[PDB]
Every structure is written in C-alpha cells, then in structure tokens.
Amino acid sequence: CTTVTPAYKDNGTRSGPCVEGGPDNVAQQFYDYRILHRSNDITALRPYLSDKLATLLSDASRDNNHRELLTNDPFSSRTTLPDSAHVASASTIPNRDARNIPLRVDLKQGDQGWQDEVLMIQEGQCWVIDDVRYLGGSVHATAGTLRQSIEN
Amino acid sequence: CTTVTPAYKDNGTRSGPCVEGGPDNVAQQFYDYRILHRSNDITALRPYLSDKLATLLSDASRDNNHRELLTNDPFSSRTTLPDSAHVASASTIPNRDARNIPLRVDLKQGDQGWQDEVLMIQEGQCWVIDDVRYLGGSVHATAGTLRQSIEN
Amino acid sequence: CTTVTPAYKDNGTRSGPCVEGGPDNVAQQFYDYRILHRSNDITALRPYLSDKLATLLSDASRDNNHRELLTNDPFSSRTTLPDSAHVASASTIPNRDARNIPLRVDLKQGDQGWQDEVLMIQEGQCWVIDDVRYLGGSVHATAGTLRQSIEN
Amino acid sequence: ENLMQVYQQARLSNPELRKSAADRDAAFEKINEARSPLLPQLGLGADYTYSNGYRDANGINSNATSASLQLTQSIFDMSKWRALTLQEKAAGIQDVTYQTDQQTLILNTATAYFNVLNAIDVLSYTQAQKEAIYRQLDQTTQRFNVGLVAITDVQNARAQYDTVLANEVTARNNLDNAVEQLRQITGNYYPELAALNVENFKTDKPQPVNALLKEAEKRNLSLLQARLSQDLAREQIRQAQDGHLPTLDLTASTGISDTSYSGSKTRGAAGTQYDDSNMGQNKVGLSFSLPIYQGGMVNSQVKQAQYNFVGASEQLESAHRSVVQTVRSSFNNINASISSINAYKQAVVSAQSSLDAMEAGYSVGTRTIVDVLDATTTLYNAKQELANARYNYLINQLNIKSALGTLNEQDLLALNNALSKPVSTNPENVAP
Amino acid sequence: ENLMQVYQQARLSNPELRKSAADRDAAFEKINEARSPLLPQLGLGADYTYSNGYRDANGINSNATSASLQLTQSIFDMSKWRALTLQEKAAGIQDVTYQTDQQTLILNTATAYFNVLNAIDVLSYTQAQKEAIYRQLDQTTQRFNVGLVAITDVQNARAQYDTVLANEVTARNNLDNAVEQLRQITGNYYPELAALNVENFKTDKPQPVNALLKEAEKRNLSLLQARLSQDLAREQIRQAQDGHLPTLDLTASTGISDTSYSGSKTRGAAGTQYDDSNMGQNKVGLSFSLPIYQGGMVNSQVKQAQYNFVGASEQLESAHRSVVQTVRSSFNNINASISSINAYKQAVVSAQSSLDAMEAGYSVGTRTIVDVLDATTTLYNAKQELANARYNYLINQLNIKSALGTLNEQDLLALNNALSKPVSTNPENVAP
Amino acid sequence: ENLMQVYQQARLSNPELRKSAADRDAAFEKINEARSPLLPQLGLGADYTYSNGYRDANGINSNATSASLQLTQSIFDMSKWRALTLQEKAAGIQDVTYQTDQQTLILNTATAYFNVLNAIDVLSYTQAQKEAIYRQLDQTTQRFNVGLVAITDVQNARAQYDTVLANEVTARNNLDNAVEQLRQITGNYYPELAALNVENFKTDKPQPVNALLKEAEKRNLSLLQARLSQDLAREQIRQAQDGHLPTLDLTASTGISDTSYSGSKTRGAAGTQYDDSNMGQNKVGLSFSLPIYQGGMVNSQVKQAQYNFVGASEQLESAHRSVVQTVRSSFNNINASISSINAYKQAVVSAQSSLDAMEAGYSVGTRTIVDVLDATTTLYNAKQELANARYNYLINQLNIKSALGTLNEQDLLALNNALSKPVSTNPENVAP
C-alpha cells in the first residue's frame, strides 16, 4: 500500500510539558480551562503556551509596564472572559511536517461574538498555542497579536 | 435562482441623444444610415457618435486643416462609400459592466472588401460608436484610427 | 485528414557521409561499431561525428596535448571499452523540426554501469551524434562533456 | 483637470478593471451551474430499430420504435451540496481579488498622475540649464575671437553644449512618455493638469505603527483572501471525505413502444407469441447505491485533501508575515520621506540665498551674467528635487493607506485640496 | 563571423525555438483528434458468463457466450463541429505565438552579438587606464625615493593602482560572460567577430509616427493574437449555446450468442423453454435525443461564455492601447539616440584635440609622459561611449521594426553592411 | 546568535518549506489513488420500482424490488499500470523540486544574515559622518559670529547638516527593514548577532572550472529535473500508445429480486405466466473488449505525445546550456571578488595612514579637529566597504556551492568559523 516518508527529521526540542495533542483539541482544552476557572493565571497555563509565550509573559509581568493588559484579558480581544467558545475544526494532521496552523476560534459572550484567531505549533510531539491575533472589532488594547503587543 | 450584482454603479453621464441599444445593432444601423443617405454628414450622425467623436469632428471641421479627410470619408478605410456592410455579432451584453467592445466590420464594395473595425462604448444606458481603426490595406489617409488622425 | 506543415525550411548543410537514420538506431550502430572493432580510431568513426566533432578531434590529435585522453577512450566515462550497450528509446521523430535530442545510454562492463549521455542532432537529412557528456561516477579525465574537454 | 476628475475618468474607461469585473461576474454566475444537478432533470428520447435474425432465428425480422420521457431527481447526495458551497467560496475569493484590483487601479492612476508633474519640473530645469550653457559657450567663443584662451576650451564648451542639447531632447521625450502613460491608463488626452500648491501643503506625522498593525490585521485584503482560501481547503477536505456516504435517486418515465414481426417464421403457427405489440409503460422507481471498498480511492483522496489544507495554512502564515513586514516598511518610508522633505527645503533656501548674492554682485558690478545664470540653474534644480520629494511623500501616504486595505477615493479627495494651480503639459508650451 | 552568419547559425541550433515549433505542431495535430468523434467508430467485444440460480430458480444453471461487432456513427451533432472549429482557432493563435517567438529570437541574438563588441571596447579602454595609472604610481614612487612627497601620497597611488587592477579583472570577466551568453544563444564558440565601420555608418531619420501607427495597427502580432482570441471566445459562446440542440446517431451490430442450460430443474419436462440456443442478430437502428430543462446548466453556461467574451474584448482593448504606447515610445527613442550620437561625436572630437595638445606640449618640452597617457585614457573613454551609443542606435532600429511586427532577416542583412572588419574576442589577445 | 543557530531556527519554522513538503507528500500519496483502480472494486446496490401498464397492457401493474452485491476486477489493462508509473515519476520530480527549495532557503537565510551586518556598518559610518558635519557647521557658525564669512556659507553648512540628518534617518530605517526581513524569514527576533572576524578570515582560491563543470554535470538539481521530465515524456508516449491494446475484466454478482403483479388483467386465467417471483442469481462472468478504428484518435494522440517528447528534449538541452553558463559566471564572480577584497584592503590601509598623519599634525599644532574628524569619516567608509566586500565573497562561495547542487548546512558550518564577535542590532544601542 506504501506510505509517505516525512520530509523533516526532528521538528522537536520541547522543554515544558503539554497536553496529549490535537490542534483543535488543544485549543478547546485551553478555552475550557480558561472558563472553568475565573483567575486567568499564567503559571497554570504553561502546558498550553509553547516556549516563548511563557517566558515573554513572565518578563512582561516582571516588567511592570503591561499590568492593565495582563490583568483584564491577554488571550482575548475583549476585556472580559467569554460565555462560550468554539474552535474551528481541523481533521487531523498527517505525519509531522506541519507547523503554523492558524485557527479562527469563534467566541460568544452575551449576544456578541468576535471570532478571534490563534496559532498552533508542534515544538516537539504535542500541539501548543501561539500568537493569538485579536481578530475582533474594538480590540482589547495595544495592537495586533499578543507578541506584537508585548514585544520590545 | 440567485442573480449577479453589477460591480459598477454609474457607467453613465450621457449628454446627447442616442439610439435604443445593442452594440452590433447600433453598428449595423449606423452603416444602414450611411448607405441610405449618400451625404455622410456629421450633424445628423450625432446619435451614433458617442460624446467626444462628435466634438472632435466638429473642431476638426472648424480647424480648416482636414478638409480632404472630412470630404471623402472619415468613417471608413476606403475613400468611397461601401456597397454592403456586415457587423460582427455579439450575443447580448449581461448587466452593465462592459465597455470598449471592438467589432470587426466586414465591408464589401464592388467585388472587393477590407474588413474595417469599430468600437462600441456604453456612456450612459445605450451603445455608441467610437474610434474606427482603418483595418484594411491601402488605408484612406492619415494614420491608424480616426482619433489619431484628427487628434493634436 | 490534414498534415502538419514543418516550421523550418532547410535544416541542412551536411558535408560528410552519414548513416541511414534513426536516433536510437544511429547511437546503437555507433556503439556496436565501437564494441566490434577494438581500435577506437577516429577516422573510421567519421560517418558518426557531425561536422565539428570530426574537426575538433582532428585538431586535438594534431595539437599533441590530449594524447592520454585520446589513447584510453574519448567517447566514454571509462578508459576501457564496455561489454554491452543499451541506448535509450525514442519512438520516431515527426517531420524535421527536431534537434538536440540527448539520450541516456546504459553501458555495462563486468557487473558495472555508468549510464552516459550522448547528444544527437539532425544536421542535414540523417541523425548524427555529438557532445557526449560522461554522466557517470569516476569520470575518465578532463571535465564534463567531451567538447568541454577538448575545447580551447 | 485635477486628480479627482482624472481618477473618475480612469475608473469609467479602463480595460483592466472591466476584465476583472467580468471574471468576477462569471464566477458568481457559475453558482447556478453548480446548483443545476440538484434540480430535477427531465428529457425526451426516441429511437427506431430494425433487427434481422440469423442462425437459429432464421427468417425472423423485427421492427421496434420506442419513445420515452424521463425525469430524474436526486433525493440525497451530499456531493452536490458540497460542490455548491465550494462554488460560493470561490466566488467570494474572486470578489476579494476584484477589490484588490480596484485598490491597485487607484494606486496606479495616482502614480501616473504625479509622474507628469515631475517630468514638467525636470523639463523646466533642463531649459534653464540649456540657457546657461549656451551663454557660457558664447562667452568662451567671444574670448577666443578676441584671443584669451586656446582652441581646446572652445571645443570643450561646444561638447558641453551638445551634451545639454541631447539632455533637453531626452527630457522632452520623457514628458511625452509620461503623458502617453497617463493616456494609456485613462483612455484620454489631458492637455492641462492641476499642479501642487505650496501654501496648502503640510506634512503630518502618521499614527503609531501599533494602530496601523491593529487595523491591517483585520482589514487587509491579502490576509482575508488567504483565510478564505484556507476555509475553501477545509470545505474541500469535507467534500473529499463525503465519498463514503451512499446515494439515493428518484426516477419516473413514460414510454410507448410499437413492435412488429415479419419475415417468414412469423407467418406460421405461433398465433400470439409472434404479434405486433403496442406497449405503454408508466414507470416510477427509486435507486439506492452504497459504495464499498474501492482500493485506496477515498482514503487517499482524504489524505491528499488534508495535505492541501496544511499547505493552505502555511500560505496563510506566510501572508500574515508579509503583511506585517509591508506595514513596517511603509511606516518607516513615510518617516524617511518627511526627514528628506526638511533637508530639501533647507537646500532650496540656501540656493535662493546664493542666487540673491549673485544677483546683488551683478547689480553692483562685480559679477557677470553667466554667474547669475548658473545660480538660477542651481535654484531650479533644488526646486525640482523638493517638488519630487513632496510627490513621493503623497504617494507614500497613499501606500500606507493601501497597506491597511482601506484605500478609496476619499483619500484622493484629501489629496486634491493641495492641487490648485493648473499647468499646461505641452512640451512646446512649457519650453519652446 | 558577422551578424548574418551568427543569426543563420542561431536559427538552426537554438533550443527555445524548437520547443515552440514542437508545441505548434502538436496544436496543429490536435485537429485530427478533435475531428475523430465525427468519423465513424467501430469495435469488437466478446464475453462469457456463467450464472447459477438460487431461491425459486434452484438447480438452474446457464452458460452464455456472446461476441458482438458494433459500428456507430453520428448524423447531426453541432457540438463536434464547434469543437473542431475551436481547435482550428487554437492552432491559429499558437502559430501567431510561434511567429512572436521568431521575432524575439532575432532581437535576442542581435543584442547578444552587440554586447560582445561593447565589452571589447570597455576592456580596451581599461587597459589604457591601467597603463596610465601604473605610470602615475611609478612617478609618485620616484618622487618619494628622491624625496618630494610624504608617504601618504605613495599609499594613495598604490591604492588607486590596486583599484584599477580590480577594474581590469572585472572588465575581463564581463567580456568572458558576454562571449558565454553568445555561445548559449548560438550553441557555438566565436573567436572573432565583425566590428562596426566608422565610414559606412550613417544615421537616417525615421518615418513619421503616423505611418508607424498605420502599419502597426494592422501588422502587429499581439493585436492579431488578441483579435483571434476574441473570435475564439465568440465561437466558445456559440458552442456553449449549442447545448439546446438535439442529437441523432445510427448504430449497427452483428452479434453471435451461444447459450447452454443445465441443472436439476432443467433436466425435466421443460421440453422447449430449456434448450441450448445459437442466436444471431444483425441489429441496425437509429437514435434521437432531445434534452429538456436541466436546471440552470446550459443557460448558466451561456451567461458564463458571454462574460468570458466581454473579458476577451477588454483584453483586446488593453492590447491595442499598449501597442500604441509602445510604438510612440520606440519612435521617441530613435530621436533621443540621434541626439546622443551627435553629442558623443563632438565629445570625441574635443578629446582628440586635448590629446593633440598634450602631445605637442610633450614634444616641445612643457609636459610629461603622464599627461599624454591621461589624455589617451580620456580619448579611449570617449571612443567607447560613442561606439556604445552607435550600437544602441542599431538596436533601436530593430526595436522599431519589431514594434510593427515586420521583423525578419532582411533587416539583419541591411544592418550587416556596417560590419566590415574582424576583431578577435580572446581577452588575452585583445589586451594581454 | 551565529549563522548556524539562525539557520536551524529558520529550517524549523518557515512557511515556505512546509508548503513544499506538503505538496511533496500529496504527490507521493497520489500513488495510492493511481494504483487503486487496479485493486478489486466491490459495492452494494438496491432499488424498488413500480410500473403501471398502458395501452395494450391495460390493467397490468408490477412491483419489483432488487438488491445486488457486485465485485469487479480488471485482469489485463496496462493503461492503469502506465498511469501508476506516471504518478511515480511525478512524485520523483516533486521531490527534486523540494530539494531545490531547501537549497534556496539556505541561500536566502545566509543573504539576510549578512545584510543585517552590512546595515549595521553603514549606520555606524553614517553617524560618524553626522558628528563630523555637525562640527563643521559649528565651526562655520563661529567663524560667521566673529565675522569671517558671508551668510551664504552658513546657509550651505546648515543644508549639509540637514542632508546628513536625513541620511542618518534613512540608514536607521534600512537597518530596521533588514532586521524585519530576518524576522520574516525565521519567525524570531534577534537583538544580537555574530560579527565577522578579521584575523580568522582568509580567502582561498577556488577549484578549477573544469572540476566544477564535471561535478555540476552529474550533480545539479535542474539537470536531474529536466532528465526526469524527459523520462516522463517517454512514459507518456508509451501511455498514449497503450490505447491500441484490448482490455479484460472479471465480474461477479449476487442478486436477489422480489416481483409482484396486480391489476384487472392479472386476476385472470394466466396461471403460471403472471405470478409473484422470488428470484435469485449468483452470476460470474468475463468480459473482453478490443477497440478498432476510431478515426484518428489514438494515432493523433501518439503524434502529440511524440511532439511533447521533442519539446521535453529541447527543454533538457536548454537547461544544460543554462547550467554551464551559470557555473562559469559564478566562477568568474568569485575570481573578481578576490581582487576586490585586495583593492579594498589597500584602500583601508591608505585611509589609516592619512588619518595617522592628520592626528600627528593635530597633536603638533598644524591641524584642527575638523580635519581629523573628516579623516575618521573616510576611514570608517573604507572599513564599511571592505566588510561589505568580505560578505559578498562569502555569499559568492555559497553560490558556487549551490550551482553544483551540493548545498547543505556543512557549508554554513565552515562559514561559522569566521563569525566570532557578538554585536547588538538595536539601532539605539549600537547608534545612540
């Protein structure tokens, strides 16, 4: 029947722990965790954030310049947590030659929606969150994506 | 059943009077009028000339430089009127996003023929003549199209 | 039924004698001649060189600089003649608008193969071999193709 | 004729936006063809056949004429609905492409309009240079005729004059080519264009690059097109996966048939089994079909669709990166343009001061006419450079507006307020 | 080797025109495949089938072997004729493309031939520059050794000498690359080329742009291709609209069948209904089919074809505008080149006068060898610039002739009269 | 961050190589879909039909429900095998394309990495020029204040200062854009890179062009792609010729049927000819088909395939010629780069000598601070030019390695030994 040999070899070097897998699966788990609790803390979200978002957010918290952004909602286009979330589907990922998978997650507050966008990267053998593109009208603060918002 | 919405909105600003419509239809009636009356006068052809060939021809006549061109024939590649004309067909024009339709007009004098070409433009809500490009051997006079012949 | 009209007119100016025709046929005949007579002399190969490989080889022989190239073998990637040759298949050639047809020949010494490549051109009304490019590991000497090897 | 009227005329008659509009209209119209198989399909067909027997059926001949009317309709077939959705998404992406074409038309007409003013300024500078060089050559010839310099100086002066003549010819041809490009874009000849006004022109710092990126993330056309393409790829995945499902069709038919037998054995003792028949059938039925294992087929197609989806996602990421880089580059470009405007203004001021010094010296009696002519030439060169820099700044503002995907004629309206004084564009008029 | 022989060799062995010719031949051969459905079709087919009864037909088995020779032929189907006409028009447009490729080959070989002469002149100038700079450096070293200048002057002179050495290496590599490009475009190595003749070269005024436009309107290749494409689009409209028409075929078939029965039920009192049959049928018949309402289908196809025709007309208008602009620009280029030629000729005369001045001063005793060497360098630079301008004029003539679509080897033959003397192209031979 | 880590990060995350890998994987997966028709195909299908008689069959109604399981398998049809081989060859050429994409990614990342360093050097030189020009302007202002020059000199100095400020802004934006391009390539921000080492950098002579050509003959990627394309064209000829051969299929089916009759004529004395039947069949059959003359069809297809093969051969010859020209050009490029390096080194030495002379003069008392500032500016310009030449030489070595189709990270490892000293990239940090 034959198979396809992956083009890449390693596609790895992961340090922190992560959820089992599945891009849409991991995104749905992240957005379920963010609503199950109402703290929106950074240290308990490490399995989802990949390797650079975690250190960048830690340094942003230690910088004492983005306090207002880090308090309300750094991971969403609205200052308040949403009532429900629905991540766009992606019917599996063959082999391991796949990074930078953007997904348009549809959020719903009280009779409102913003339809934000997030990124999936492999970085090892799991799937992890990146960027978050703030794809809703009347965005929270700063600019564009989270990385552009907090980078120097 | 659905319908297409035209991309444009105005496609207009027509000043002078004009015939009902139909690119091939108008181009055929123009030649029918020209053969019917052997005068070939620009004052009674205004419904066919678009909006700028009319004023260009009027100023060329008043310029007293193009007497020989305006006398014999300005609308054909041959110095004499044709015996019969046949306009290349165009099976209708949907909506209103269509101008600059060139038609290869087949003229036939006594056992001859040179197959000139004309332009059809909308300029409002009907179809009007333009350019005429002298697409035949042994061109009458001047150069290329009529507009290049009478422009300055 | 209709018949295509060849784009070119002459495609000729052949001086020396030449074999009947057929690109794969001519290449196979050339290699059979090489295997049969173990002399590999240039002058007996004249009906196979085109018009310039003949004079280039003659001037190279008279130049007294490429003796080692000529003695071992000029027409293959190895200093010794092969045991069998199999020229690639080209299923005929319509009309006469066809030149620069390279074929990958498969030559077999004792349980070895090198898969050289030969150019073929029309140059008149028959098919003739040119260039030869030494497409094998452990190239005999000089560089690249034979023409590049003997050119000044 | 200012920029606004030029843009309106170009939008009216431009044989490059009409083509895209027609292509978009065809893409929108293809939706009906895509939805056509869903709708009921009915037809009529008749035939006539004469058969002659052989071997065991020796001497048996038949003549049968049939005529049927058929009507078929699919009850459940997900593939047609998937194709309809795919056609809708393709029409959407084509519309996005048409919007991009409108934006690039606006940009092109603005650039082609400013090129003519730049050419006019260059031609004026070249005319001033020609006057100065001719006066210098005349001075050198007078000096030689009286006798003060060798013949080599005269030859050098003549060479410089010929070079200046060639430069003037080149500048005239450049102005002609600019006017011809404007005619090609707009399909009309413009013998007079509104020029820049220095009193009404001012430079304003743009908004911070953060706001520009924020707007361009959710407003850029390329990003929207890439996102729509990714959605289309997902729908293609689903359509390819829909091959496992079964299909159901409903069929109706009304047929008549007339058959006659003859030849030999028919005219025998058969009686009723060999007789002419006038048959009529009103058939109605269903048809269910469930595909089963077909080698790879559907599974391989699903894997191919998934790989295509991965590729589309990579394209989307690349488009986002390119958009960010373009926005940053445009912001820095406009900043550099302002910084260059200031320097060119100062250079113009210095050249004017030098010319005033030269003129005062000539009036008092310490300088010749050639010196003030060269001063005027330098001043004209500085003026032309400053005007070109101003036009570049305006074009950069338009480029920044376009990078966000929010370019329309309202920005041309804002630009139009700086174009007041008209200037003729005839090369003979501006420089006889 | 002059331009004529170079082009004659290039036309023969060039793997860019051969591919276009093969594509043209394939497009022309496609006419037979397009006409094939119209011609009668026939075939032979045999089969053998064993069937085993079940349920009610328990213990009944059949074995039937059939062999049928069939011959079908259409009578009235406009779609095939429309497809044939479409294929013919496609072959025509492909032929137009091949003619365009021929013109581009002529232009490319002319440009690549003149680049070699330009590189030769550049290298010849650089050699003299190197000699003069080396003499200057030697002079500076002598002055330092006697002691008249500081060490900084010696360092600067050595730096300039190294710079001119690098420039010489660059010019040599440029000549080598030009020769390699010529070999790539002709498949041959040319060790000696014909150069320009000073006396035989004369510049003539071009014909008025009006005549150029008149000829290019009816003889340009791009305009003809666009017009043919519009005609093909109209034929596509007609072919798509021809879906309303009915169709009619006739079939003939000669079939031989051999059937045998077995099983427990057959081996009974059936008598006549269960026997081996040796059947033969010479079936001949007709078939008529008239499709009726099929959803949108044909109507949407007609609308799409009309939109495609509108787009093709827009393309034709754009092509005409581009052709006009190209003709105007190419006409202006010739006059610009004439003015440049005059200016460079005057500059050459002035440089020669300066060199004569330096030589006379050196012979009298008021000058050094360095001065005359620098004068020679300047004269060589002027000569190289003039020669390059002449080559540009010769190329511009071919560009003018190609804008009208009337380029052929007769123009090259006319141009060949200006190439008289042979010059080698070996970098060591021209400048050791 | 030296070159190796940057390249590893770029290879990890780059949305231009991932799309190529996805396309390669899809092309390799298409083999299964191409081979699937060879494998057995089985399905299940049921239907139910109610028929009502008319005319002679008045009062006759039937209801028949059928269900059949079918399994078909092709015994001999070499067209499918030829299609499988074609798919395999297409996968191979796609893999070759992927290798080319890897090579161009390596080239792009190296080019961007060196561009950033060039921008850093340019910015440093520009700020040195800014310091010198500001000191000159202050000197002129002081001279005017005590009174030694006219106001025109002050205006000119201010104009020079403003021009220098604009140039500094431009250089800063250039550095920012270079960093942005690096981020676009690698998807990361580097505030720290590795600079060139002057002691560890040495220029080595390249191998003879003959060895380069010998390697590039059998190792270049484009030549391999063209050869594979010609092989695919030959396989296409064979696939087109395959149409003459006959085909053979084997079919099996298990079917059940249930038929019932009703109506006025049914309720009669038919007895055994009008009854409900519960029928069942287990059919097994073989089918053979031999197409015969079909017009041109297959013959025209064979001719078309042969013409396509001729075109592919022309493409192969053109690719070989282009490869040879490219290798020769790259060899000459590196040979010229060596001489450029030597010349710029000598220029730097001369500039340093001039600066030392100016500094000694200033210390003794014969010079001002402006002179040594200008000397430092010239020295910085020479240093920047030399560094840019060194980076160009390294990139030319990479191009030499890439032209032979043997580029990989092992060459970046060799280049990494010359990058030792870290350097910041922030414009304010390196240029306050």
Residue numbers in the entry:
A (entry chain P3), B (entry chain P1), C (entry chain P2): 19 to 170
D (entry chain C3), E (entry chain C1), F (entry chain C2): 23 to 454
From the study:
Tripartite efflux pumps are essential for Gram-negative bacteria to expel a wide range of toxic compounds, including antibiotics, across their dual-membrane cell envelope. Among these systems, the AcrAB–TolC complex of *Escherichia coli* is one of the most thoroughly studied. It comprises the inner membrane RND (Resistance–Nodulation– Division) transporter AcrB, the periplasmic membrane fusion protein AcrA, and the outer membrane channel TolC. Structural analysis reveals that YbjP, a previously uncharacterized lipoprotein, binds TolC in a 3:3 stoichiometry, bridging its protomers at the equatorial domain.
